[PDB]
Amino acid sequence: PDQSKAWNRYRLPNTLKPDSYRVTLRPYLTPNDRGLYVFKGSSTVRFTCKEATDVIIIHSKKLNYTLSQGHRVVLRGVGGSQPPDIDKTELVEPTEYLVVHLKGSLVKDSQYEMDSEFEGELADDLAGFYRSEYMEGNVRKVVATTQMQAADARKSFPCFDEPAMKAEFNITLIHPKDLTALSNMLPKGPSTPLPEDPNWNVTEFHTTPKMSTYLLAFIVSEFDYVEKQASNGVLIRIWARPSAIAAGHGDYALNVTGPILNFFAGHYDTPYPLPKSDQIGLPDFNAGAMENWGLVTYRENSLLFDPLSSSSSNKERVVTVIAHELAHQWFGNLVTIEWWNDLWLNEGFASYVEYLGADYAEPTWNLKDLMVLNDVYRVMAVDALASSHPLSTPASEINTPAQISELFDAISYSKGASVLRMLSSFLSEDVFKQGLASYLHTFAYQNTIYLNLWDHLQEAVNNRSIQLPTTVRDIMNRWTLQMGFPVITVDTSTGTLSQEHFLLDPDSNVTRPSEFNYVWIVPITSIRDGRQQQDYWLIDVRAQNDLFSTSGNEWVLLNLNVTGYYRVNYDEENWRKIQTQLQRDHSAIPVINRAQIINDAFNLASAHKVPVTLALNNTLFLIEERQYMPWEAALSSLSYFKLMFDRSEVYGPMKNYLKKQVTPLFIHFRNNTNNWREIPENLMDQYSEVNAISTACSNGVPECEEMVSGLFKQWMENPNNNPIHPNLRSTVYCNAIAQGGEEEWDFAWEQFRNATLVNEADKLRAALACSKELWILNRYLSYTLNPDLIRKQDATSTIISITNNVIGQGLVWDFVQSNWKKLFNDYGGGSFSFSNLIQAVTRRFSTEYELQQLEQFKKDNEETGFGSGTRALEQALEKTKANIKWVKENKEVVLQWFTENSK
Amino acid sequence: PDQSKAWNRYRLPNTLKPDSYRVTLRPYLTPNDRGLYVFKGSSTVRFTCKEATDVIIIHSKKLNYTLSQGHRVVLRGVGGSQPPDIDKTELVEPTEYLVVHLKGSLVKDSQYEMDSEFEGELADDLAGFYRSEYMEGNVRKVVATTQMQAADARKSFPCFDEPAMKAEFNITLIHPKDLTALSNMLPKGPSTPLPEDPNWNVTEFHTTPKMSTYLLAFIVSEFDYVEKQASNGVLIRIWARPSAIAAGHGDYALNVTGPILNFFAGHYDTPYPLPKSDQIGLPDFNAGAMENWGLVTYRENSLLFDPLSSSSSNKERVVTVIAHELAHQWFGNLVTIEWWNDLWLNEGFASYVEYLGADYAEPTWNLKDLMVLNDVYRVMAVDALASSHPLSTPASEINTPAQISELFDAISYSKGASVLRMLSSFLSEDVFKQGLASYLHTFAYQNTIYLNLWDHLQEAVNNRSIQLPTTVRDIMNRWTLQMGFPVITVDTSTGTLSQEHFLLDPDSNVTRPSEFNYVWIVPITSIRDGRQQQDYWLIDVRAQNDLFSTSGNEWVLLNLNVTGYYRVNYDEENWRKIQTQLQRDHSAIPVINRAQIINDAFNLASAHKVPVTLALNNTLFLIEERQYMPWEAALSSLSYFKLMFDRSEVYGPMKNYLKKQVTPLFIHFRNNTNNWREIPENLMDQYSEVNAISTACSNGVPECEEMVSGLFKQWMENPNNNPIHPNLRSTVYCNAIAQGGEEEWDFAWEQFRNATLVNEADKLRAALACSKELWILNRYLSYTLNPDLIRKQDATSTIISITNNVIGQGLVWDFVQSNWKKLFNDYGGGSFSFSNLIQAVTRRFSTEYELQQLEQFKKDNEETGFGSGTRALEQALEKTKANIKWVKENKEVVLQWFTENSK
Numbered sequence A, B: 001p002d003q004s005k006a007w008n009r010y011r012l013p014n015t016l017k018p019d020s021y022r023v024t025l026r027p028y029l030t031p032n033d034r035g036l037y038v039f040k041g042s043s044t045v046r047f048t049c050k051e052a053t054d055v056i057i058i059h060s061k062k063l064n065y066t067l068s069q070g071h072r073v074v075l076r077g078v079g080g081s082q083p084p085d086i087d088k089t090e091l092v093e094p095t096e097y098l099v100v101h102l103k104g105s106l107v108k109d110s111q112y113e114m115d116s117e118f119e120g121e122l123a124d125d126l127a128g129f130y131r132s133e134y135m136e137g138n139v140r141k142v143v144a145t146t147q148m149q150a151a152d153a154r155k156s157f158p159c160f161d162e163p164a165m166k167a168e169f170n171i172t173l174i175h176p177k178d179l180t181a182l183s184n185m186l187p188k189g190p191s192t193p194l195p196e197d198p199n200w201n202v203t204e205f206h207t208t209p210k211m212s213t214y215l216l217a218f219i220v221s222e223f224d225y226v227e228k229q230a231s232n233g234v235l236i237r238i239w240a241r242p243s244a245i246a247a248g249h250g251d252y253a254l255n256v257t258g259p260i261l262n263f264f265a266g267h268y269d270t271p272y273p274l275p276k277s278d279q280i281g282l283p284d285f286n287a288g289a290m291e292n293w294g295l296v297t298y299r300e301n302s303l304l305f306d307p308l309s310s311s312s313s314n315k316e317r318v319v320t321v322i323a324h325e326l327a328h329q330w331f332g333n334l335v336t337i338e339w340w341n342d343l344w345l346n347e348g349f350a351s352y353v354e355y356l357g358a359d360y361a362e363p364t365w366n367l368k369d370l371m372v373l374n375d376v377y378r379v380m381a382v383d384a385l386a387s388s389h390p391l392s393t394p395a396s397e398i399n400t401p402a403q404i405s406e407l408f409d410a411i412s413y414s415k416g417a418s419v420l421r422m423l424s425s426f427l428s429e430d431v432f433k434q435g436l437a438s439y440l441h442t443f444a445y446q447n448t449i450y451l452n453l454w455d456h457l458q459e460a461v462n463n464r465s466i467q468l469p470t471t472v473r474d475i476m477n478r479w480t481l482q483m484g485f486p487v488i489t490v491d492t493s494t495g496t497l498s499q500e501h502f503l504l505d506p507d508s509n510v511t512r513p514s515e516f517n518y519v520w521i522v523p524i525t526s527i528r529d530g531r532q533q534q535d536y537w538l539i540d541v542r543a544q545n546d547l548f549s550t551s552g553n554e555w556v557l558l559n560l561n562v563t564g565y566y567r568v569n570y571d572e573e574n575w576r577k578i579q580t581q582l583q584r585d586h587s588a589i590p591v592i593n594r595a596q597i598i599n600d601a602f603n604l605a606s607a608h609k610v611p612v613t614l615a616l617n618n619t620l621f622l623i624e625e626r627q628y629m630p631w632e633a634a635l636s637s638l639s640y641f642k643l644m645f646d647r648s649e650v651y652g653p654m655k656n657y658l659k660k661q662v663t664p665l666f667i668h669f670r671n672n673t674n675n676w677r678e679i680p681e682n683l684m685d686q687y688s689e690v691n692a693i694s695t696a697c698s699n700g701v702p703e704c705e706e707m708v709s710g711l712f713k714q715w716m717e718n719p720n721n722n723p724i725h726p727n728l729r730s731t732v733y734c735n736a737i738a739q740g741g742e743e744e745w746d747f748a749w750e751q752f753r754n755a756t757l758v759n760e761a762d763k764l765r766a767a768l769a770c771s772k773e774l775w776i777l778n779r780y781l782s783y784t785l786n787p788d789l790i791r792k793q794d795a796t797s798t799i800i801s802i803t804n805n806v807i808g809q810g811l812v813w814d815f816v817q818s819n820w821k822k823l824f825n826d827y828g829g830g831s832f833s834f835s836n837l838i839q840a841v842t843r844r845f846s847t848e849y850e851l852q853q854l855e856q857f858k859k860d861n862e863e864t865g866f867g868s869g870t871r872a873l874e875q876a877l878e879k880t881k882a883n884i885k886w887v888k889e890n891k892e893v894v895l896q897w898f899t900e901n902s903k
């Protein structure tokens, strides 16, 4: 399309800026004659002309307009302005605009109003204003609900749909008189009967604060709720299907929501300004949750909790997701990104601050620690590629909804959180939260870029007379504007340190230039024989300091508790001292640093910076490790080995090794739990237990295989009296299905179809993918695609579980190659992303044959395009090339190591 | 290359014709300095010039010449002829010629001699003069041995290497004095010491009869033998490695060989003319056996037999292969094909006549009957394709060694045998063998084409005043010169019959024209309610006769005992009467016709001539069938269903159905064998038992799974006291490995590596491919390629066993696509063929995705070419296209049928 025309460009003009809107929406929750569920609406937007223009460009997606006064819209003056007549309108589909061509130009610094009347489908597509469905007995319940993030508000009413186009919104919902209407604000006065039809109520809501379009929510349902006024006076309600509320499954959410909201208000010295915060769980929802201001939406598995059937991991998911959503009330809603390229200002903050909130609510769980695994190490895998991207991408590169959706990724979330964790560490949280309070106060009801944050943190540093090697901006720009992270290499003979950009493939091509030269300013903490030393700042590529020199028996480790976003290598002598320490008394090294030593060495090995046997040697001590984290870090790093080797001669010896390493831990838990009758008191110990069972069974410990098959058989014999503790269900179900046959599978499928608890359905859905029978996986694949059997929101998640199974690899890859066009249409756009699927189906690739298929897949589908999976495909090509070389270099030494160390 | 030059054309000129040869060969059975095993030789060929020519074109492959008198060869006169001087010689590699360019022309009807001195590698390539190796303790034994068929005599000495170039051969072998030299004939006088080195003996053999080059054999070994003069005065010796002979493992061969030789000499009224017939078993051999005149070579599994460890199936293999080889002494050696396009004159005859000989030796086994399964139904699968070929291909189409090798296929062997079985049936064997005696007498020491056979059968018909609807030639040309076979469709309402060319795909393109219009002259036998009717000849496309009309309860079946090479369809009413008969008393229908009803209906269903449920309904009675053959025919037809469905939702219900159908038979055998302590007396009942066990275990009968895993465990606990009867070992080993894990696999691999019995090694080698673990199949694939672990002769056989496993499908197909060039070099030419591998890896293909891979595989390797697998690839493309359509048309009805009938 002609790029010279503004209506063919993806960013809105700067010529017009909205002030406020009124919107009336009326969903029809029964099908029409055509069998369509529809909504009808109207809107008036009041806006200011900032520069003279003869066109109104406004977003509109899948809306049909009712003609009024001869055109798609009516344009009126405000405060005496006299707008031109409308010539014609057009709908421009690629850029998603309604374009109003005028017979003259609007006047600079004048206001106007535009009125529209429209209709859209209330589709089951989880996007915009859409329908969710559930059964209560044999009665079909239909719910009208919304998901605007990022660019779907325009699919519900015409609007200037970019996050810096903030406005007040005056919402009216027209709905069946028996159903409750909900929105961001509370109702304004009473609901009144619709004049034309008293079977409907008209419910107007109070005006919203100035806010972004992507945060609006409109819901019509017959949900029930529980409620409690929080200690800061805000009303909290937890809303869900009536049976869930009556069963008490909203009670845990009610226990934690208000207290976390009040905690954040205190911690950041910034009140929550709205009269209420509703939490609502939807049967059909395409994310964990969404932070709509005043009406936070959740999938059921992230909000509801059944103390008798949900696991401790499920409970942890509920409190952390609630905390993340509530964090956004400050970081996202009150203060909002200027544009999506800086998404981490919303998502990095919510991902970090969620742990502070969850830790407040559950102080005995020690959750803050899990950031090392869930954030730092999660994102370092992709951030070690040449095809990663900076935390803050240049704004001019992010234009289309696909490019926007793509940024909701491990960089924006987990690297955002890691960099904030690092910053808080070197500033102290007291100084950090002081700068944040200032940031929030200054930019309340406005939009920010990354520089605005640094300015306010600088203000706090300057007030506290904190001395840093340079300004906050210059330290943090290194971590924000260029991709990747450094490996810091220590020579303990001389006390020298040096840094370089860590790349998993040495022979990979960094094409994105950095004005920072891939050199960082790095805060370095360290310990010497377990005692913390003075902090150090590495400002250059290399330095020397006696802090890093050792003699005699001494060892040093850098990055205490992995507060910093960097990996560490040492000379081989220091590594040997570390390995000696792990054999002598592993408890002398902080638990997070035991995870670090394992995870760093495996990644260093991939990068050819240490021999692979060094990384494998670092797992030897695990035979007597009882802590969750070091085991989890090892299993996560060895996941790569499984992906590379589970179709090869190396796999037997690998499984033999893991069997040996985990057996004493499995036996410890068997004894300590009084033969699986009890679960450990401590949360991390509960997680350690689950990992010991999972690892024991996956790798062939016979006592584990007997245990899980026995428990599952006992359940089959007593379907309504499940004997398996909730914590153990995922792993018992998966391993019992893997060990069993068609009869176990069919039992679990019927339990899934009949499930009344979402946490229970989820565990079964994953377990069913554990079948070793190809014909069963093929049949299951066909079910994942049938929305009457597996909810559309769960289709790609289940397909990923199938491809993770070694027997499902060929099946799913061939399926994806053969069906890309149709798949892309159904689960690749709108509220959906195919990024996770591309990543999962390709991560085993380690052969030229598979690389050629992947290259051909790219070529064959270049025209369809890959939308929000574009970068995942580039990353898959890079990783596959690295994998071919790594397998060639490592397969013999790894086979020999596992063989020689598993006996 | 320039096609105008005779040395660039594949067929020899007709200008020169050999009379006799002397050849001296000296193998060196220890490596030289270069590490090469070599042979050195000399030859003189005496030949007649038939038309004046200035070039001698003679075959030569991988031979290096020692210059003599200034050139590669010396040309001398005979009987006063005066040959021109040699200008120069060249070796032309594609056509495999030594080309001797002369300074003038040879004279028509004059004789000449050409002398050569040469050297070749005694390679481990199983072709020409090659080396075989075995260990006796820690001593490496090296054997020089030969395989000339079809076009490798030229790889041992220069010769006019085409089968109609018959000559006498005077062989001398120079060999270590301690080793025995063997050839076609007996030694001529004593062995004498080599003058230059008395550590070697020189052994000259008597002149051969006039014979073809592909039948020559030269062997040097320290084998031992057992011997017996046969009743026709011919000396028989069975030669093998000393340990096998001492163990008595040559004894069964000695029991059967002479008696079968004498039987054939009597039956065909034609003496075997040579003084001896040696049978020799080689450790390295690329076929079942080879019929060299006077020195028949065998792989060990086809000649040796251990009564304490070989199965009844193994014993049947030995007698039938010996019988096949001995049949060739008449059909192939005494009388020889003019050219390879008429190969069935050798191979069709040996494949049919083998049963007559084996039945003579083992009259209680009823083997002749197995022709229906092993010949008729084996070949009808490929002969129903548009890409099949006639029994007698036009001679001008068969030129290269690849094209020749390709003809050693189910058409030349099994269709050849089926057509001869049909001919014998309509003539009577008395009249058949009378015409054959005449054929053999007339063409002894000469070469024939298919017309020569008809002429001699006609002579017998005319002598006996047999009346046929036309001449033997005109009846049999229909079965010989066009591909395929008819389906005869009966309308029992009206007594009408009609025929059409049977094509598995209706939408497949027959491109090879037939001067016979794909119309046959068909001898039709029939039964009515079990009573045989008068015979009928269908000479036209349609006819009417009251023989084929029924009324009331009567049924008719055509093709009693399937003597004729045709399929039969009926109107649905007659089919229903047949199905009623099978429910009432299945024994009222001859056993071979129970197999026919099943096999025909399944093939008819594929061809869209009956509904698939009709073919499935024909298997219902199997629940009370105890006979081997109908079960085997059903399992063979349902193999297709397994290939189409074992990666689909249909597979569960299919296995459930087979489980139901086989359980009573399995329980019958469990009881009748006194819990597997005994085996049945009757051979077919022994085979029925094995099939019941195999089918029960494959489809999940729990008593079977427990039985096999129990027996295998008992063996592991007592390795030197195997508790599994030899008949049961293949199926017990495979199913125990499938049910087990790494420990069962490793035990069987060590048993394989340590095997001293070839029959035992073979069963283990197949069983190891039954692992359900992808990593284990991948590791095993790597072993198949290592000649130190699996003998080169067994590499592709083992790869085929892996691809037959559903879990091995993707593995092997991806391997074949990725490694075609190297694979083609190693196992695709010379004595090797890749035809079986192409057929096996592609037979599951039923998707557009797989078709596209196959088409791309063809394109990608068009330049490498596909040699003797060319037609198998064309057939795979045709079948894959048919399979995609068949699965689409049948998957729902088949799923429903198996589901509704398995309960």
Ligand SMILES: *[C@@H]1O[C@H](CO)[C@@H](O[C@@H]2O[C@H](CO)[C@@H](O[C@@H]3O[C@H](CO)[C@@H](O)[C@H](O)[C@@H]3O)[C@H](O)[C@H]2NC(C)=O)[C@H](O)[C@H]1NC(C)=O
Residues within 6 Å of the ligand: A020, A021, A022, A044, A045, A046, A168, A169, A170, A207
């Ligand atoms: C959404 O609802 C809000 C709140 O009711 C509306 O804001 C109100 O708008 C009216 C009319 O513009 C304001 O009164 C006027 O103020 C202007 C100054 O701009 C003055 O010149 C006029 O004489 C008149 O008094 C009123 O103050 C304002 N209320 C608040 C609390 O801001 C808003 O107009 C609605 N937007 C739409 C598109 O319906």
Ligand SMILES: *[C@@H]1O[C@H](CO)[C@@H](O[C@@H]2O[C@H](CO)[C@@H](O[C@@H]3O[C@H](CO)[C@@H](O)[C@H](O)[C@@H]3O)[C@H](O)[C@H]2NC(C)=O)[C@H](O)[C@H]1NC(C)=O
Residues within 6 Å of the ligand: B020, B021, B022, B044, B045, B046, B168, B169, B170, B207
């Ligand atoms: C292979 O060995 C055979 C058998 O020893 C050789 O056949 C013999 O060849 C000689 C010499 O040609 C024959 O004698 C001659 O016969 C011709 C008639 O063609 C006559 O004109 C001469 O006066 C002379 O007597 C001899 O009959 C023949 N023996 C037999 C049994 O056929 C043959 O030559 C050898 N071939 C080679 C290439 O060494």
Ligand SMILES: CC(C)C[C@H](NC(=O)[C@@H](O)[C@H](N)Cc1ccccc1)C(=O)O
Residues within 6 Å of the ligand: A149, A150, A151, A286, A287, A288, A289, A290, A291, A321, A324, A325, A328, A347, A350, A404, A405, A408, A830, A831, A832, A833
């Ligand atoms: C627990 C949280 C991860 C839940 C919630 N998640 C999200 O907002 C993302 O998953 C987004 N739903 C991802 C996305 C954006 C645009 C188009 C398609 C998909 C959030 O608050 O960030």
Ligand SMILES: CC(C)C[C@H](NC(=O)[C@@H](O)[C@H](N)Cc1ccccc1)C(=O)O
Residues within 6 Å of the ligand: B149, B150, B151, B286, B287, B288, B289, B290, B291, B321, B324, B325, B328, B347, B350, B404, B405, B408, B830, B831, B832, B833
């Ligand atoms: C029991 C018999 C099948 C044994 C024996 N078989 C054969 O001769 C064939 O298998 C041939 N060995 C096939 C062949 C021919 C040319 C090049 C490569 C392979 C035979 O006598 O026909």
Ligand SMILES: *[C@@H]1O[C@H](CO)[C@@H](O)[C@H](O)[C@H]1NC(C)=O
Residues within 6 Å of the ligand: A036, A038, A039, A063, A064, A119, A120, A121, A122
């Ligand atoms: C919008 O109009 C299109 C084109 O006529 C029609 O197909 C579609 O159903 C309409 N949408 C609704 C919700 O009525």
Ligand SMILES: *[C@@H]1O[C@H](CO)[C@@H](O)[C@H](O)[C@H]1NC(C)=O
Residues within 6 Å of the ligand: A251, A252, A255, A305, A307
């Ligand atoms: C919520 O808190 C109440 C009161 O402390 C407690 O009894 C209940 O167990 C809590 N619910 C959950 C799910 O922890």
Ligand SMILES: *[C@@H]1O[C@H](CO)[C@@H](O)[C@H](O)[C@H]1NC(C)=O
Residues within 6 Å of the ligand: A434, A435, A438, A456, A459, A460, A463
């Ligand atoms: C810094 O101190 C000034 C002067 O007291 C105060 O007004 C401001 O709020 C402080 N800023 C921060 C970020 O603490």
Ligand SMILES: *[C@@H]1O[C@H](CO)[C@@H](O)[C@H](O)[C@H]1NC(C)=O
Residues within 6 Å of the ligand: A611, A613, A614, A617
């Ligand atoms: C791993 O440990 C083994 C055994 O102690 C040792 O021989 C080897 O050197 C270690 N690997 C490295 C890279 O240090």
Ligand SMILES: *[C@@H]1O[C@H](CO)[C@@H](O)[C@H](O)[C@H]1NC(C)=O
Residues within 6 Å of the ligand: B036, B038, B039, B063, B064, B119, B120, B121, B122
């Ligand atoms: C034949 O000559 C070629 C070319 O010199 C040589 O490489 C090969 O080894 C020779 N073959 C034998 C058996 O000596």
Ligand SMILES: *[C@@H]1O[C@H](CO)[C@@H](O)[C@H](O)[C@H]1NC(C)=O
Residues within 6 Å of the ligand: B251, B252, B255, B305, B307
């Ligand atoms: C060969 O025949 C002898 C004598 O009849 C018999 O004892 C022996 O069992 C036979 N060998 C085999 C393997 O059948």
Ligand SMILES: *[C@@H]1O[C@H](CO)[C@@H](O)[C@H](O)[C@H]1NC(C)=O
Residues within 6 Å of the ligand: B434, B435, B438, B456, B459, B460, B463
């Ligand atoms: C046919 O009969 C003639 C005359 O007796 C006889 O010479 C010839 O051998 C016979 N041919 C056949 C094929 O039986």
Ligand SMILES: *[C@@H]1O[C@H](CO)[C@@H](O)[C@H](O)[C@H]1NC(C)=O
Residues within 6 Å of the ligand: B611, B613, B614, B617
């Ligand atoms: C197969 O048998 C079923 C059940 O008797 C019958 O309903 C069906 O018609 C049969 N199929 C055919 C093709 O006759």
Ligand SMILES: [Zn+2]
Residues within 6 Å of the ligand: A324, A328, A346, A347, A350, A351
């Ligand atoms: Zn978020």
Ligand SMILES: [Zn+2]
Residues within 6 Å of the ligand: B324, B328, B346, B347, B350, B351
């Ligand atoms: Zn043969």
